[PDB]
Design a protein around this ligand. Structure first.
Ligand SMILES: CCCCCCCCCCCCCCCCCC(=O)OC[C@H](COP(=O)([O-])OCC(O)COP(=O)([O-])OC[C@@H](COC(=O)CCCCCCCCCCCCCCCCC)OC(=O)CCCCCCCCCCCCCCCCC)OC(=O)CCCCCCCCCCCCCCCCC
Ligand SMILES: CCCCCCCCCCCCCCCCCC(=O)OC[C@H](COP(=O)([O-])OCC(O)COP(=O)([O-])OC[C@@H](COC(=O)CCCCCCCCCCCCCCCCC)OC(=O)CCCCCCCCCCCCCCCCC)OC(=O)CCCCCCCCCCCCCCCCC
Ligand SMILES: CCCCCCCCCCCCCCCCCC(=O)OC[C@H](COP(=O)([O-])OCC(O)COP(=O)([O-])OC[C@@H](COC(=O)CCCCCCCCCCCCCCCCC)OC(=O)CCCCCCCCCCCCCCCCC)OC(=O)CCCCCCCCCCCCCCCCC
Ligand SMILES: CCCCCCCCCCCCCCCCCC(=O)OC[C@H](COP(=O)([O-])OCC(O)COP(=O)([O-])OC[C@@H](COC(=O)CCCCCCCCCCCCCCCCC)OC(=O)CCCCCCCCCCCCCCCCC)OC(=O)CCCCCCCCCCCCCCCCC
Ligand SMILES: CCCCCCCCCCCCCCCCCC(=O)OC[C@H](COP(=O)([O-])OCC[N+](C)(C)C)OC(=O)CCCCCCCCCCCCCCCCC
Ligand SMILES: CCCCCCCCCCCCCCCCCC(=O)OC[C@H](COP(=O)([O-])OCC[N+](C)(C)C)OC(=O)CCCCCCCCCCCCCCCCC
Ligand SMILES: CCCCCCCCCCCCCCCCCC(=O)OC[C@H](COP(=O)([O-])OCC[N+](C)(C)C)OC(=O)CCCCCCCCCCCCCCCCC
Ligand SMILES: CCCCCCCCCCCCCCCCCC(=O)OC[C@H](COP(=O)([O-])OCC[N+](C)(C)C)OC(=O)CCCCCCCCCCCCCCCCC
Lengths: 284, 99, 206, 50, 58, 66, 187, 50
């Protein structure tokens, strides 16, 4: 009786506080999402060229929240390996496809004739798109994500870049320095974290991945700039229309786990629980 | 369980058939001293449980880390055990005899 | 039609079969063309990386008797059965002596000195010992009956063992009339014919 | 005390017998991988006698 | 002696602990997996047969 | 008595095997002997490092350790 | 062809069950291949622990009312009658275990699964076998396969247990670095 | 390993082996039945307790 009343009061207080917290989070997330949608609809990509392509602005200043969901443009060559993360888009099961993207190359060998040293590659992870579970076998190794960038019209631009080290020369006399540059545009997004209750848990040994673990993805692919990989990743966004993976557009880029819909559902659940607890307390 | 149970066991009749004056036949109920064999079993293995646990765990670990072929090494260990045991048994014989 | 006659001779049962050898040589060529595809001998052996999950590497008691004890023939199997029978009789006698129920008019496990001293734990140990011995004896009996049915009724043999029996190490029995006598006397047409078929290519549908 | 002395003597004995297999790490700059190499050893004879 | 060389199966030892790419390994052309091939020890002039079997008779 | 009898029976049988094999059965070493071996964990698994009597069932290998 | 030796022609029941379990666990066999075999497995279990029950009254109506059984019952102590009944029932149970229609059906289903495996991975089906633990049984491996089926094809998949769909990275295994070197140890 | 102990009980005689097999199986059955009768005793105790 009295113990039941005490338990009901405690449960009602806890659930009411939870509902209030989720409602405030819903308001804040809705406001931020409106701001993000307006900024994306503005469509002024930030060109990541020069020094910015070697150490990225969100790595140098360590402000990914200031650069989150942020339109950027960068050029480089994708590496062959692809990474799949289990995800659902538009209510159907599929996989997010990630590829390494080398935005800067550094050569540190001075015995060029004697030694053929591997270059130091600076890369970031690019979310190519989403492919359904049926068509995961249709993703090809070393596929062409974007058509290669056009050759520049300035004859002085056919030398190795000072910072990125890339030579935009289709016919390079230095065969070992021949690179093909493709230019992508996307949105900077931060990496994900484990949430077992959200069914985002990955078994690395079995090969089952449910959340974007940038640290593991960088380690498994033997990439170099592990910290600049862990900081964030670029989700490729095609201009207006989106065969596999299917790239995200301005209206269908992958939604974060924390959403106003999710917080509204939590608020409704907690408010209902608190109301029921108070009704039962009044009855008793 | 022993309401109508007689005192004598098989060993009592066997003893009655022998000239062993140092052993006598039980004449009272054994309920007081029931399950004493477990007590003596514990006393027999009392100082050996910890030592045997540590020794067997150590032996199994040392075998497992090297993945030795069981048949060959067990044959070798049987040979070495016979060697050492017969040496020590001869020495124990000498120690016991000279009392 | 010379090639046709040679092939028909290859498929004749009296070609690769000599008395006292494997009767499967009566259909040898047929069996060969089904197994030696592309001239390759399939390796049925299992590749094991040790994690100390097994020590004796005997899958069952039948494997133990066949391979560890090398009871490949029937006299060996019957000798092992006699040994197992003696062991089982001795184990039964030991269990009946240590827990004399039904021997001197004793009808209850309680009315034994073994139960007085050690209680139900001793009875459980004796039951486990007798059960293990009876289980192993049953397995040995099944092995011996199977070997009797195979070697004595069906007249099967351990054919590599029979081959080793026929030649006592340093005999001169390499004959031209016998295709299986040596490697030099095995005709090339048989080698070509037994390797004509090809393995299927798997569909990697997983 | 005898157990202590036994452990000390076994430790030194194990070190001495571990001398005679020269196990080192060799870098393969072509493959950018380290490998474990086993070799013999050369030393003054007085060391072997002791 | 072909039955003794366990280097033939070393490729299988990698995936006994690293299952991640075991399925990628299984989707591979079969060349000598779990099979022994003995090269010709004799000159056979039979054009009708492309490949000859030199497996030991025992 | 179990240990005593095991030791004595093994001694007699193995000694008889040693004498008989080394006096009468050395004409064919392959028939009357098996080739066995086991090496260090550091080195790759030996060719003869397999369980005997199961050569037609298993291929035994192990990962190197240091 | 009945003359071609299948790669598993020598495997025991435990080895076949373990091969099926490893194929399902390693995502070589899908959950669409199991539902028949698993069903048979369950029937086999019911065919094992129910038979003595089914054989207990039937013998009481057929065998234990015969002349030899009645002679044993009337001219021997009750303990010998119990021994005769238990021995007869146990012999019948062993004969049933060796020769059971449901056991044959389970073996046929396992054979079909192994044939599917050979059709998928070819001769590499032999790579599914290992050195099994001595006391782990074919029924235990079948139960493990059933447990894995329940885990994957049910709730908590992706929360407590790995999902059936693999998300392994797409690489070129010919060129991708490997953990183990061919002969030496690497760091 | 089995000759001497079986020799003590004269198990080289086939009749002794058959008699011992019968007696041992009966002994095993007696032990199992006496183990499983306490279940019936507990059932009756449960009836009275109800
Ligand atoms: C490396 C690898 C090894 C390399 C070296 C290999 C060995 C080389 C050769 C060694 C010698 C071979 C041999 O014969 O040895 C005897 C041989 C031992 O050889 P083994 O290795 O055991 O196997 C050889 C077998 O021949 C193998 O037989 P199998 O089982 O393969 O099949 C054949 C089978 C076929 O058998 C039959 O067919 C029998 C009849 C069956 C009737 C029911 C079926 C009827 C229907 C048939 C239907 C078919 C068609 C019929 C036609 C009509 C149409 C329907 O047996 C026989 O033909 C032989 C007689 C079998 C008797 C069966 C009963 C045995 C009882 C147990 C004896 C031991 C008890 C304990 C003793 C303890 C004290 C020592 O032993 C016997 O023959 C049995 C008696 C053994 C008593 C103890 C002997 C101790 C000393 C042994 C010395 C051996 C060397 C002698 C040297 C002599 C010169 C100095
Ligand atoms: C939490 C609980 C804690 C404990 C609570 C208290 C428990 C109390 C009860 C314990 C068990 C009671 C039942 C015992 C049955 C035997 C009774 C007896 O006296 O037998 C006579 C036997 C010797 O009689 P004997 O006339 O003086 O013979 C002298 C020599 O042994 C003559 O030697 P030989 O070379 O002339 O003869 C060779 C061979 C001759 O052997 C035979 O004749 C028959 C043996 C079987 C043969 C089967 C053959 C099958 C067919 C094979 C055919 C194929 C060919 C095979 C080829 C390969 C052959 C190698 O003889 C033997 O092997 C004799 C040794 C047998 C030892 C058995 C030890 C295990 C018993 C318990 C098993 C429990 C299983 C699990 C239970 C639970 C399940 C749920 O007594 C002993 O050996 C005494 C020691 C063993 C008795 C139990 C001691 C227990 C001590 C406390 C245990 C505490 C926990 C564990 C830690 C222990 C640390 C040390
Ligand atoms: C009551 C609650 C427990 C029920 C029994 C549970 C159990 O483990 O049942 C064994 C076993 C269940 O194992 P499973 O994996 O389901 O067997 C499937 C395949 O048959 C697997 O192939 P398998 O037939 O080769 O598997 C049998 C295997 C399975 O091995 C094991 O499961 C490990 C050992 C477990 C021992 C459990 C205590 C004894 C159970 C006796 C059998 C049930 C009687 C009712 O057994 C062994 O390897 C025996 C090892 C030596 C044991 C010697 C006896 C020691 C204790 C004696 C006490 C009296 O039951 C049967 O195989 C059917 C009933 C027994 C056969 C008829 C016996 C007529 C006499
Ligand atoms: C088939 C032939 C065997 C059938 C089963 C055994 C005989 C019938 C059962 C019986 O009552 O025997 C004791 C019965 C009464 O003897 P007893 O002197 O009054 O001793 C009474 C004691 O209470 C008990 O005295 P015991 O336990 O010393 O007598 C048991 C009998 C059991 O004999 C056997 O198990 C035969 C052993 C060789 C096979 O063993 C002997 O008499 C020992 C001498 C064995 C002579 C043959 C040795 C051949 C070595 C090669 O003696 C006989 O039946 C005499 C014939 C025994 C077998 C002779 C040879 C037959 C052919 C063997 C090769 C095939
Ligand atoms: C005869 C004297 C005892 C010999 C014991 C040898 C143990 C190993 C024999 C090889 C083997 O696998 O045996 C299986 C046998 C059991 O026979 P099994 O055929 O049931 O074992 C295989 C079990 N399944 C079917 C589940 C795979 O093991 C033993 O007998 C172990 C005895 C241990 C005794 C400890 C005291
Ligand atoms: C667990 C102990 C019993 C194991 C058992 O009976 O296994 C079935 C085995 C069956 O033997 P099996 O070899 O005929 O059958 C193998 C099982 N199949 C073919 C279905 C895969 O029974 C025995 O081994 C007989 C037991 C004899 C008495 C044992 C008494 C103590 C228990
Ligand atoms: C009284 C104890 C006398 C025996 C010496 C004990 C030395 C303990 C300290 C030590 O370093 O031990 C590890 C050392 C080994 O470590 P170590 O190899 O680093 O040696 C340390 C000592 N120096 C560096 C000086 C050589 O000794 C042993 O491992 C000895 C093994 C037998 C131990 C016997 C039981 C001692 C029980 C003490 C109970 C105290 C309560
Ligand atoms: C332990 C028995 C109960 C559990 C069981 O085995 O279930 C099997 C099946 C269920 O099998 P299942 O397919 O649900 O499998 C789950 C159980 N495992 C995985 C362990 C096999 O249940 C039954 O058959 C129900 C009736 C069991 C009756 C057992 C009576 C035994 C009598 C022995 C008499 C011997 C006389 C000699």
């Amino acid at each position: 009786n009295v113990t039941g009343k005490v338990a009901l009061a405690t449960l009602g207080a806890l659930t009411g506080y939870g509902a209030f917290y989720h409602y405030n989070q819903y308001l804040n997330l809705s406001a931020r999402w409106q701001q993000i949608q307006e900024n994306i609809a503005k469509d002024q990509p930030f060109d990541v060229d020069g020094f910015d392509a070697k150490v990225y602005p969100w790595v140098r200043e360590n402000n990914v929240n200031d650069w989150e969901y942020k339109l950027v443009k960068m050029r480089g060559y994708f590496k062959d390996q692809r990474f799949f993360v289990r995800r659902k888009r538009d209510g159907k099961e599929g996989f997010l496809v990630f590829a390494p993207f080398v935005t800067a190359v550094e050569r540190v060998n001075h015995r060029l004739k004697q030694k053929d040293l591997l270059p130091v590659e600076y890369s970031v992870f690019v979310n190519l798109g989403w492919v359904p579970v049926e068509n995961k076998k249709d993703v090809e190794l070393g596929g062409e994500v974007c058509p290669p960038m056009d050759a520049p019209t300035d004859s002085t631009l056919f030398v190795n870049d000072t910072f990125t080290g890339f030579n935009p020369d289709p016919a390079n006399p230095e065969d070992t320095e021949q690179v093909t540059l493709t230019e992508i545009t996307g949105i900077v997004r931060r990496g994900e974290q484990q949430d077992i209750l959200a069914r985002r848990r990955n078994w690395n040994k079995e090969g089952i991945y449910n959340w974007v673990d940038l640290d593991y993805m960088g380690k498994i692919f033997r990439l170099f700039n592990l910290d600049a990989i862990n900081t964030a990743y670029i989700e490729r966004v095609v201009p207006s229309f989106e065969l596999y993976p299917i790239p995200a557009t301005k209206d269908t880029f992958e939604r974060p786990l924390n959403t106003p819909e999710r917080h509204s559902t939590f608020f409704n659940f907690y408010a209902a629980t608190s109301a029921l607890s108070f009704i039962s307390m009044l009855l008793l | 369980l022993y309401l109508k149970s007689t005192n004598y066991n098989r060993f009592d009749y066997r003893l009655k058939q022998t000239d062993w004056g140092f052993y006598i036949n039980n004449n009272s109920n054994y309920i007081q001293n029931i399950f004493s064999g477990l007590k003596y079993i514990w006393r027999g293995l009392r100082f050996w449980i910890i030592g045997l646990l540590l020794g067997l765990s150590s032996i199994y670990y040392l075998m497992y880390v090297r993945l030795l072929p069981f048949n060959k090494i067990i044959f070798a260990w049987i040979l070495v055990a016979m060697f050492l045991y017969w040496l020590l048994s001869g020495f124990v014989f000498f120690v016991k005899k000279y009392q | 039609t010379a090639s046709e006659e040679e092939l028909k001779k290859l498929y004749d049962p009296n070609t690769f079969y000599e008395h006292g050898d494997n009767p499967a040589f009566k259909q040898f060529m047929n069996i060969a063309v089904e197994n030696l595809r592309e001239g390759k001998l399939t390796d049925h052996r299992t590749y094991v990386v040790d994690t100390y999950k097994k020590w004796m590497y005997a899958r069952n008691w039948d494997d133990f008797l066949q391979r560890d004890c090398k009871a490949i023939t029937f006299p060996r199997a019957f000798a092992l059965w006699i040994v197992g029978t003696l062991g089982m009789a001795t184990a039964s006698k030991w269990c009946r002596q240590i827990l004399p129920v039904g021997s001197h008019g004793i009808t209850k496990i309680s009315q034994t000195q073994f139960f007085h001293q050690f209680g139900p734990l001793g009875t459980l140990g004796a039951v486990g010992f007798y059960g293990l011995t009876a289980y192993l004896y049953y397995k040995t009996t099944i092995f011996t009956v199977k070997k009797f049915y195979s070697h004595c009724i069906l007249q099967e043999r351990e054919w590599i063992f029979e081959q080793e029996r026929q030649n006592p190490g340093y005999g001169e029995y390499f004959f031209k009339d016998v295709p299986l006598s040596a490697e030099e006397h095995f005709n090339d047409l048989a080698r070509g014919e037994m390797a004509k078929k090809k393995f299927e290519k798997p569909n990697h549908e997983f | 005390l005898l157990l202590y002395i036994l452990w000390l003597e076994f430790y030194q004995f194990y070190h001495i017998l571990s001398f005679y297999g020269n196990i080192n790490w060799a870098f393969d700059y072509d493959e950018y991988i380290w490998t474990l190499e086993l070799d013999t050893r050369r030393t003054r004879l007085a060391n072997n006698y002791i | 002696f072909p039955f003794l060389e366990k280097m033939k199966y070393n490729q299988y030892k990698e995936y006994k602990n690293d299952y991640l790419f075991y399925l990628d390994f299984l989707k591979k052309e079969i060349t000598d997996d779990h099979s022994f091939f003995w090269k010709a020890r004799k000159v056979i002039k039979l054009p009708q047969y492309s490949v000859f079997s030199f497996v030991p008779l025992k | 008595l179990s240990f005593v009898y095991l030791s004595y029976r093994l001694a007699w049988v193995l000694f008889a095997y040693v004498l008989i094999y080394n006096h009468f059965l050395l004409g064919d070493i392959g028939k009357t002997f098996n080739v066995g071996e086991w090496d260090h964990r550091l080195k790759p698994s030996a060719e003869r490092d397999y369980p005997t009597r199961y050569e037609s069932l298993y291929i035994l290998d192990r990962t190197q350790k240091w | 062809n009945n003359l071609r030796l299948k790669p598993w022609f020598h495997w025991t029941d435990e080895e076949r069950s373990h091969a099926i379990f490893s194929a399902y666990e390693k995502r070589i066999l899908k959950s669409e291949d199991l539902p028949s075999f698993l069903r048979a497995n369950r029937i086999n279990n019911v065919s094992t622990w129910v038979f003595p029950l089914i054989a207990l009254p039937l013998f009481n109506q057929s065998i234990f009312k015969l002349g030899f059984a009645q002679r044993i019952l009337l001219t021997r102590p009750a303990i010998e009658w119990h021994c005769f009944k238990i021995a007869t029932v146990a012999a019948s149970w062993l004969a049933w275990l060796n020769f059971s229609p449901f056991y044959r059906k389970l073996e046929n289903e396992k054979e079909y699964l192994l044939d599917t495996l050979e059709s998928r991975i070819g001769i590499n089906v032999l790579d599914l076998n290992d050195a099994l633990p001595r006391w782990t049984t074919s029924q235990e491996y079948n139960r493990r396969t059933q447990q894995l089926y329940n885990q994957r094809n049910g709730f908590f998949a992706g929360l407590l247990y790995p999902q059936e769909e693999s998300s392994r990275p797409l690489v070129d295994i010919a060129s991708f670095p490997k953990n183990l070197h061919k002969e030496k140890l690497t760091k | 390993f089995f000759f001497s102990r079986a020799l003590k009980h004269r198990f080289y005689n086939p009749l002794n082996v058959m008699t011992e097999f019968k007696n041992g199986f009966m002994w095993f059955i007696i032990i199992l039945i006496n183990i499983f009768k306490p279940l019936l005793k507990l059932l009756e105790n449960n009836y009275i307790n109800l």
